[PDB]
Design a protein around this nucleic acid. Sequence first.
RNA 1: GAAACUUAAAACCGUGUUGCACUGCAACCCGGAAUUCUUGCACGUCG
Length: 54
Amino acid sequence: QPVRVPGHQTREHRQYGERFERKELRKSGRPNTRPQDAVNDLFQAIRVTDSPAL
RNA sequence: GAAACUUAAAACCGUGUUGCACUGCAACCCGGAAUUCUUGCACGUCG
């Protein structure tokens, strides 16, 4: 569906964003855990170091 | 022959360490395995 923000209050505007990421990025599938746990996040396999000092 | 106590009195007693020498001792790791880890833009809004 084309993304529509449901509602008027800012509390349901908050809870829509923290579930779209948790659906589209928690796709690791560890054997015995909750499927929306932080160890299932796909962005744990990318290591971005700092920049050198300018 | 019938009649008159080999009787009376007298501690099996006195003295004397079941005592002298002798280590419940010698040898022995509270030791071997284990990431304070996983997710997160110092950012948004301008008569």
